[PDB]
Every structure is written in C-alpha cells, then in structure tokens.
Amino acid sequence: GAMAQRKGAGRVVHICNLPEGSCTENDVINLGLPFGKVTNYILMKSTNQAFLEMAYTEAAQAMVQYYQEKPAIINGEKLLIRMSTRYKELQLKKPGKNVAAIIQDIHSQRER
C-alpha cells in the first residue's frame, strides 16, 4: 500500500480482445499511458481480460473516450480499451511501485 491513486478517486480500465502470449504486460500498460497515467495492473489471462489502474480519474476517462473512438491495436488485433464497471480500483495485494517510478508522464510534476 501507500502507493498509486495520486488523486483520491481512481478508475480501472478493462482491455479486451487480447491475444494470449502475443501481448506483454508492458503493451497493455503502454497503451493506456498515452492519454492517462497507469499506476497498477491486474492480468486475468484465464478470462482473456486485462485491468489497468489510472493515477487520475481524468486520466482513465480521457484515455477511454479516445480509445473507444480510436482503439489501440496489437499485432493487427483491435483492443477495445474501455472503462471497467466491475472494478473501481486495482487493489494490488503484492509488493510493487518500488524503484520503478512510473512518473514518466504529464500531470505529474516532479518525481515523488
């Protein structure tokens, strides 16, 4: 804990149409980042689904509005990147956010 959710809101984006073995953890995160910062992620390969956490609720909303109109593509596969209705935030029960400061993205202002 004591990490992520830079603003007191949080939103999860769920990404579908993901090929198993073709997408990496990075691709899913890197696709969300361009319009909104990602803090955390949950990968459910069993359901062929990915969940992505955004540092700012605006980040999640802004990116998805873009990706619902212009969705992101991996290896010719069109990923619908969209708001998750099931998850409000990705509650990682694993150690993370150490060393790797995902503060390489606008709306940050100084690494903390």
Tab-separated table of N, CA and C in Angstrom:
chain	number	residue	atom	x	y	z
A	1	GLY	N	0.828	-1.229	0.000
A	1	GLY	CA	0.000	0.000	0.000
A	1	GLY	C	0.845	1.255	0.000
A	2	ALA	N	0.220	2.382	0.350
A	2	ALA	CA	0.892	3.682	0.393
A	2	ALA	C	1.481	4.049	-0.968
A	3	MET	N	0.788	3.651	-2.026
A	3	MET	CA	1.247	3.909	-3.382
A	3	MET	C	0.064	4.042	-4.328
A	4	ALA	N	0.318	4.617	-5.501
A	4	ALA	CA	-0.696	4.795	-6.538
A	4	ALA	C	-1.850	5.674	-6.064
A	5	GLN	N	-2.874	5.796	-6.913
A	5	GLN	CA	-4.032	6.645	-6.631
A	5	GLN	C	-3.580	8.021	-6.164
A	6	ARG	N	-2.973	8.755	-7.085
A	6	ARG	CA	-2.383	10.050	-6.786
A	6	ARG	C	-3.460	11.063	-6.428
A	7	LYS	N	-4.592	10.955	-7.099
A	7	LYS	CA	-5.775	11.711	-6.728
A	7	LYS	C	-6.803	10.779	-6.101
A	8	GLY	N	-7.569	11.305	-5.153
A	8	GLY	CA	-8.489	10.487	-4.383
A	8	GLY	C	-9.737	10.099	-5.151
A	9	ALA	N	-9.564	9.247	-6.146
A	9	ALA	CA	-10.673	8.751	-6.943
A	9	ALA	C	-10.362	7.355	-7.467
A	10	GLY	N	-9.560	7.286	-8.523
A	10	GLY	CA	-9.183	6.003	-9.084
A	10	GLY	C	-10.230	5.444	-10.028
A	11	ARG	N	-9.763	4.811	-11.097
A	11	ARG	CA	-10.628	4.135	-12.059
A	11	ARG	C	-9.861	3.036	-12.766
A	12	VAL	N	-10.536	1.930	-13.009
A	12	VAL	CA	-9.936	0.825	-13.723
A	12	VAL	C	-10.448	0.775	-15.150
A	13	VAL	N	-9.530	0.587	-16.073
A	13	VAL	CA	-9.868	0.363	-17.460
A	13	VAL	C	-9.698	-1.111	-17.791
A	14	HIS	N	-10.685	-1.705	-18.442
A	14	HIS	CA	-10.583	-3.103	-18.811
A	14	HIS	C	-10.329	-3.212	-20.306
A	15	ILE	N	-9.358	-4.026	-20.666
A	15	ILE	CA	-8.974	-4.192	-22.053
A	15	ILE	C	-9.294	-5.603	-22.526
A	16	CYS	N	-9.974	-5.687	-23.659
A	16	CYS	CA	-10.411	-6.960	-24.207
A	16	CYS	C	-9.790	-7.193	-25.581
A	17	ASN	N	-10.060	-8.369	-26.151
A	17	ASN	CA	-9.551	-8.751	-27.472
A	17	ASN	C	-8.046	-8.974	-27.425
A	18	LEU	N	-7.555	-9.341	-26.249
A	18	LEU	CA	-6.130	-9.551	-26.040
A	18	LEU	C	-5.737	-10.981	-26.385
A	19	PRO	N	-4.828	-11.165	-27.350
A	19	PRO	CA	-4.256	-12.475	-27.638
A	19	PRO	C	-3.311	-12.929	-26.529
A	20	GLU	N	-3.506	-14.145	-26.052
A	20	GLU	CA	-2.617	-14.721	-25.056
A	20	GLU	C	-1.258	-15.038	-25.670
A	21	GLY	N	-0.205	-14.574	-25.019
A	21	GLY	CA	1.142	-14.853	-25.474
A	21	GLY	C	1.675	-13.812	-26.438
A	22	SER	N	0.791	-13.031	-27.039
A	22	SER	CA	1.223	-12.035	-28.010
A	22	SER	C	1.386	-10.668	-27.355
A	23	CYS	N	0.506	-10.361	-26.418
A	23	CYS	CA	0.608	-9.128	-25.657
A	23	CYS	C	1.498	-9.337	-24.442
A	24	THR	N	2.284	-8.335	-24.094
A	24	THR	CA	3.065	-8.397	-22.875
A	24	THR	C	2.435	-7.495	-21.831
A	25	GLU	N	2.896	-7.579	-20.592
A	25	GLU	CA	2.389	-6.704	-19.544
A	25	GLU	C	2.596	-5.247	-19.941
A	26	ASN	N	3.738	-4.988	-20.571
A	26	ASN	CA	4.124	-3.638	-20.952
A	26	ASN	C	3.165	-3.058	-21.982
A	27	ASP	N	2.779	-3.862	-22.975
A	27	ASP	CA	1.935	-3.372	-24.070
A	27	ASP	C	0.621	-2.826	-23.545
A	28	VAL	N	0.004	-3.579	-22.649
A	28	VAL	CA	-1.285	-3.206	-22.083
A	28	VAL	C	-1.171	-1.888	-21.322
A	29	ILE	N	-0.125	-1.780	-20.516
A	29	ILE	CA	0.134	-0.576	-19.735
A	29	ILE	C	0.492	0.596	-20.649
A	30	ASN	N	1.373	0.331	-21.604
A	30	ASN	CA	1.874	1.355	-22.515
A	30	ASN	C	0.774	1.906	-23.407
A	31	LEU	N	-0.250	1.104	-23.676
A	31	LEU	CA	-1.378	1.565	-24.477
A	31	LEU	C	-2.282	2.507	-23.689
A	32	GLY	N	-2.357	2.320	-22.378
A	32	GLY	CA	-3.189	3.186	-21.560
A	32	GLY	C	-2.514	4.515	-21.264
A	33	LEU	N	-1.215	4.444	-20.998
A	33	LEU	CA	-0.412	5.609	-20.599
A	33	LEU	C	-0.604	6.863	-21.478
A	34	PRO	N	-0.607	6.757	-22.833
A	34	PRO	CA	-0.600	7.942	-23.713
A	34	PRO	C	-1.656	9.000	-23.388
A	35	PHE	N	-2.826	8.583	-22.932
A	35	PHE	CA	-3.857	9.549	-22.577
A	35	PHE	C	-4.122	9.606	-21.074
A	36	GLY	N	-3.670	8.590	-20.352
A	36	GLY	CA	-3.778	8.600	-18.904
A	36	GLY	C	-2.714	7.747	-18.223
A	37	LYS	N	-2.188	8.233	-17.101
A	37	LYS	CA	-1.139	7.529	-16.366
A	37	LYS	C	-1.671	6.276	-15.672
A	38	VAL	N	-0.865	5.224	-15.704
A	38	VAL	CA	-1.183	3.955	-15.084
A	38	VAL	C	-0.366	3.787	-13.814
A	39	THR	N	-0.998	3.320	-12.753
A	39	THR	CA	-0.284	3.083	-11.512
A	39	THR	C	-0.099	1.590	-11.268
A	40	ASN	N	-1.119	0.810	-11.604
A	40	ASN	CA	-1.152	-0.613	-11.284
A	40	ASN	C	-1.895	-1.378	-12.368
A	41	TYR	N	-1.768	-2.700	-12.364
A	41	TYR	CA	-2.451	-3.525	-13.350
A	41	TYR	C	-2.781	-4.901	-12.776
A	42	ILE	N	-3.852	-5.501	-13.287
A	42	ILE	CA	-4.216	-6.873	-12.952
A	42	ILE	C	-4.502	-7.641	-14.236
A	43	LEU	N	-3.814	-8.751	-14.419
A	43	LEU	CA	-3.915	-9.516	-15.647
A	43	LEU	C	-4.605	-10.848	-15.415
A	44	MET	N	-5.803	-10.991	-15.959
A	44	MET	CA	-6.519	-12.250	-15.879
A	44	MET	C	-6.535	-12.923	-17.240
A	45	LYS	N	-5.484	-13.680	-17.506
A	45	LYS	CA	-5.320	-14.373	-18.773
A	45	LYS	C	-6.364	-15.473	-18.916
A	46	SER	N	-6.782	-16.017	-17.780
A	46	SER	CA	-7.791	-17.064	-17.737
A	46	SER	C	-9.108	-16.600	-18.361
A	47	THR	N	-9.444	-15.333	-18.169
A	47	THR	CA	-10.660	-14.781	-18.743
A	47	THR	C	-10.361	-13.984	-20.008
A	48	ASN	N	-9.092	-14.015	-20.426
A	48	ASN	CA	-8.623	-13.270	-21.600
A	48	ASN	C	-8.910	-11.777	-21.436
A	49	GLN	N	-8.658	-11.259	-20.243
A	49	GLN	CA	-9.002	-9.881	-19.929
A	49	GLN	C	-7.888	-9.216	-19.132
A	50	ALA	N	-7.758	-7.911	-19.285
A	50	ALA	CA	-6.760	-7.156	-18.546
A	50	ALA	C	-7.394	-5.947	-17.883
A	51	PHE	N	-6.916	-5.623	-16.693
A	51	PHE	CA	-7.416	-4.481	-15.953
A	51	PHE	C	-6.272	-3.527	-15.649
A	52	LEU	N	-6.495	-2.252	-15.902
A	52	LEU	CA	-5.443	-1.260	-15.809
A	52	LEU	C	-5.884	-0.111	-14.894
A	53	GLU	N	-5.003	0.292	-13.980
A	53	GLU	CA	-5.315	1.318	-12.979
A	53	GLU	C	-4.717	2.663	-13.369
A	54	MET	N	-5.473	3.729	-13.168
A	54	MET	CA	-5.014	5.057	-13.536
A	54	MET	C	-4.812	5.940	-12.313
A	55	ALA	N	-3.731	6.718	-12.360
A	55	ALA	CA	-3.342	7.596	-11.260
A	55	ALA	C	-4.382	8.671	-11.010
A	56	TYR	N	-5.066	9.060	-12.072
A	56	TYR	CA	-6.054	10.115	-12.006
A	56	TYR	C	-7.318	9.634	-12.687
A	57	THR	N	-8.457	9.981	-12.119
A	57	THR	CA	-9.730	9.568	-12.679
A	57	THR	C	-9.939	10.210	-14.051
A	58	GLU	N	-9.401	11.417	-14.238
A	58	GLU	CA	-9.452	12.084	-15.536
A	58	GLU	C	-8.616	11.327	-16.554
A	59	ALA	N	-7.522	10.743	-16.089
A	59	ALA	CA	-6.618	10.003	-16.951
A	59	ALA	C	-7.330	8.804	-17.557
A	60	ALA	N	-8.073	8.091	-16.721
A	60	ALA	CA	-8.813	6.920	-17.159
A	60	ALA	C	-9.951	7.305	-18.098
A	61	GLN	N	-10.695	8.341	-17.727
A	61	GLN	CA	-11.827	8.794	-18.530
A	61	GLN	C	-11.360	9.311	-19.887
A	62	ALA	N	-10.330	10.151	-19.868
A	62	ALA	CA	-9.836	10.796	-21.080
A	62	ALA	C	-9.314	9.782	-22.082
A	63	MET	N	-8.557	8.805	-21.594
A	63	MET	CA	-7.958	7.817	-22.470
A	63	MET	C	-9.031	6.962	-23.130
A	64	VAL	N	-9.998	6.522	-22.343
A	64	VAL	CA	-11.022	5.619	-22.831
A	64	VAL	C	-11.918	6.289	-23.857
A	65	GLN	N	-12.237	7.556	-23.644
A	65	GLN	CA	-13.046	8.287	-24.608
A	65	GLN	C	-12.330	8.319	-25.951
A	66	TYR	N	-11.007	8.431	-25.906
A	66	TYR	CA	-10.199	8.335	-27.109
A	66	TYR	C	-10.208	6.911	-27.658
A	67	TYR	N	-9.962	5.925	-26.801
A	67	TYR	CA	-9.788	4.539	-27.253
A	67	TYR	C	-11.101	3.877	-27.646
A	68	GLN	N	-12.217	4.438	-27.233
A	68	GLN	CA	-13.499	3.938	-27.692
A	68	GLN	C	-13.804	4.459	-29.094
A	69	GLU	N	-13.210	5.596	-29.437
A	69	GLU	CA	-13.370	6.177	-30.766
A	69	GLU	C	-12.210	5.783	-31.679
A	70	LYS	N	-11.015	5.758	-31.114
A	70	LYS	CA	-9.822	5.290	-31.809
A	70	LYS	C	-9.071	4.297	-30.929
A	71	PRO	N	-9.498	3.032	-30.949
A	71	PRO	CA	-8.940	1.982	-30.090
A	71	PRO	C	-7.523	1.590	-30.501
A	72	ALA	N	-6.788	0.983	-29.577
A	72	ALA	CA	-5.388	0.653	-29.810
A	72	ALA	C	-5.258	-0.761	-30.349
A	73	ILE	N	-4.247	-0.986	-31.169
A	73	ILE	CA	-4.106	-2.248	-31.873
A	73	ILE	C	-2.776	-2.926	-31.554
A	74	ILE	N	-2.838	-4.220	-31.253
A	74	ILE	CA	-1.637	-5.027	-31.074
A	74	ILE	C	-1.626	-6.195	-32.056
A	75	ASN	N	-0.645	-6.194	-32.956
A	75	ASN	CA	-0.451	-7.285	-33.918
A	75	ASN	C	-1.678	-7.471	-34.798
A	76	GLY	N	-2.303	-6.365	-35.172
A	76	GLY	CA	-3.469	-6.431	-36.032
A	76	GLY	C	-4.751	-6.681	-35.264
A	77	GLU	N	-4.640	-6.804	-33.948
A	77	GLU	CA	-5.802	-7.047	-33.110
A	77	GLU	C	-6.237	-5.746	-32.457
A	78	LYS	N	-7.498	-5.397	-32.638
A	78	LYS	CA	-8.020	-4.146	-32.119
A	78	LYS	C	-8.489	-4.320	-30.688
A	79	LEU	N	-7.762	-3.723	-29.764
A	79	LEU	CA	-8.124	-3.788	-28.366
A	79	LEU	C	-9.117	-2.699	-28.055
A	80	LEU	N	-10.261	-3.068	-27.539
A	80	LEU	CA	-11.156	-2.069	-27.034
A	80	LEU	C	-10.726	-1.733	-25.619
A	81	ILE	N	-10.159	-0.552	-25.466
A	81	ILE	CA	-9.741	-0.078	-24.165
A	81	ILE	C	-10.858	0.787	-23.610
A	82	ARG	N	-11.468	0.340	-22.525
A	82	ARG	CA	-12.686	0.975	-22.046
A	82	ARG	C	-12.819	0.901	-20.531
A	83	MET	N	-13.709	1.726	-19.995
A	83	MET	CA	-13.906	1.841	-18.556
A	83	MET	C	-14.409	0.520	-17.976
A	84	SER	N	-13.842	0.117	-16.848
A	84	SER	CA	-14.286	-1.081	-16.156
A	84	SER	C	-15.437	-0.738	-15.225
A	85	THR	N	-16.505	-1.507	-15.311
A	85	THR	CA	-17.660	-1.286	-14.468
A	85	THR	C	-17.574	-2.122	-13.199
A	86	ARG	N	-16.786	-3.192	-13.254
A	86	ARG	CA	-16.695	-4.114	-12.134
A	86	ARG	C	-15.722	-3.599	-11.081
A	87	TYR	N	-14.599	-3.054	-11.531
A	87	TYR	CA	-13.555	-2.608	-10.617
A	87	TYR	C	-13.518	-1.089	-10.557
A	88	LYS	N	-13.454	-0.556	-9.349
A	88	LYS	CA	-13.309	0.880	-9.156
A	88	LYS	C	-11.834	1.250	-9.057
A	89	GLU	N	-11.044	0.306	-8.561
A	89	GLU	CA	-9.609	0.494	-8.379
A	89	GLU	C	-8.931	-0.869	-8.280
A	90	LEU	N	-7.678	-0.942	-8.694
A	90	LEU	CA	-6.933	-2.188	-8.626
A	90	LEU	C	-6.186	-2.284	-7.309
A	91	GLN	N	-6.716	-3.094	-6.418
A	91	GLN	CA	-6.152	-3.250	-5.092
A	91	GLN	C	-5.121	-4.367	-5.101
A	92	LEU	N	-3.886	-4.019	-5.435
A	92	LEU	CA	-2.819	-4.999	-5.506
A	92	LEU	C	-2.395	-5.427	-4.113
A	93	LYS	N	-2.443	-6.722	-3.876
A	93	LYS	CA	-2.023	-7.285	-2.606
A	93	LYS	C	-0.631	-7.879	-2.759
A	94	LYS	N	0.141	-7.254	-3.634
A	94	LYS	CA	1.506	-7.659	-3.904
A	94	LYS	C	2.426	-6.456	-3.757
A	95	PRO	N	3.682	-6.678	-3.350
A	95	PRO	CA	4.681	-5.612	-3.275
A	95	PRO	C	4.952	-5.013	-4.651
A	96	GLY	N	4.873	-3.696	-4.755
A	96	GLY	CA	5.083	-3.050	-6.030
A	96	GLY	C	5.339	-1.568	-5.888
A	97	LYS	N	5.572	-0.903	-7.021
A	97	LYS	CA	5.825	0.538	-7.058
A	97	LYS	C	7.128	0.889	-6.341
A	98	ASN	N	8.102	-0.005	-6.432
A	98	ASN	CA	9.412	0.228	-5.833
A	98	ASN	C	10.462	0.372	-6.924
A	99	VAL	N	11.320	1.386	-6.787
A	99	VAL	CA	12.380	1.679	-7.760
A	99	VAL	C	11.801	2.241	-9.059
A	100	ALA	N	10.924	1.470	-9.685
A	100	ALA	CA	10.283	1.879	-10.919
A	100	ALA	C	9.253	2.967	-10.653
A	101	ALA	N	9.692	4.209	-10.746
A	101	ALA	CA	8.799	5.337	-10.592
A	101	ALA	C	8.088	5.614	-11.903
A	102	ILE	N	6.844	5.178	-11.989
A	102	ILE	CA	6.032	5.414	-13.178
A	102	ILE	C	5.529	6.862	-13.171
A	103	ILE	N	6.477	7.786	-13.167
A	103	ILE	CA	6.178	9.199	-13.137
A	103	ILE	C	6.708	9.851	-14.416
A	104	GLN	N	6.747	9.047	-15.460
A	104	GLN	CA	7.189	9.489	-16.776
A	104	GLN	C	5.971	9.757	-17.649
A	105	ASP	N	5.330	10.892	-17.408
A	105	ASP	CA	4.034	11.187	-17.961
A	105	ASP	C	3.559	12.505	-17.394
A	106	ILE	N	3.010	13.317	-18.261
A	106	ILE	CA	2.417	14.600	-17.891
A	106	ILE	C	1.408	14.448	-16.738
A	107	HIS	N	1.133	15.561	-16.050
A	107	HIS	CA	0.218	15.602	-14.900
A	107	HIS	C	0.889	15.059	-13.646
A	108	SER	N	2.208	15.013	-13.653
A	108	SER	CA	2.953	14.520	-12.505
A	108	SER	C	3.587	15.669	-11.736
A	109	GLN	N	4.501	16.375	-12.396
A	109	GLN	CA	5.245	17.470	-11.789
A	109	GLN	C	6.113	16.978	-10.630
A	110	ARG	N	7.357	16.624	-10.967
A	110	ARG	CA	8.369	16.188	-10.004
A	110	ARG	C	8.108	14.769	-9.506
A	111	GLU	N	9.147	13.946	-9.532
A	111	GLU	CA	9.052	12.579	-9.043
A	111	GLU	C	9.012	12.560	-7.520
A	112	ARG	N	8.019	11.881	-6.973
A	112	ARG	CA	7.857	11.794	-5.533
A	112	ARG	C	8.104	10.366	-5.069
